[PDB]
């Protein structure tokens, strides 16, 4: 992605996915993505979403990544975020860093 394409790439990912401001009844939630792109990090999210929605955010946030195969994790107990549907609530992924590994 070009220097001018990247801000545009983040713009989709920031506005593409629902944030309903009355759904923080289950808790507003903030993800921090650790991309293998070079040490790249983007944050954001809403209430109760899915791990797969983070995978969709990666793809929306950058066009090189969709065709690449990769997995997601949390580091130090090294859990591979398996079961891509799994909600943020069930995976303990509340406010917690998510690393990407190709």
């Amino acid at each position: 992605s070009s220097p001018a394409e990247v801000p545009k790439n983040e713009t989709p990912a920031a506005q593409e996915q629902p944030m309903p401001d009355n759904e923080p009844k289950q808790g507003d939630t903030s993800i921090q993505i650790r991309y293998a792109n070079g040490k790249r990090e983007v944050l954001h999210c809403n209430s109760t979403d899915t791990v797969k929605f983070l995978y969709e955010h990666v793809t929306s946030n950058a066009n090189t990544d969709p065709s690449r195969n990769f997995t997601l994790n949390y580091a130090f107990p090294i859990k591979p975020i398996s079961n891509d549907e799994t909600t943020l609530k069930d995976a303990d992924l509340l406010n917690s860093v998510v690393v990407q590994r190709w």
Binding site: S30, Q32, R34, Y74, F76, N95, S96, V97, V99
Partner: peptide, 21 residues
Amino acid sequence: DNSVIAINSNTMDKLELFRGD
């Protein structure tokens, strides 16, 4: 573990940080 420090959760809401941070 070597590369790790432990904060409490009431410290996390007092200063936004996460498990992977």
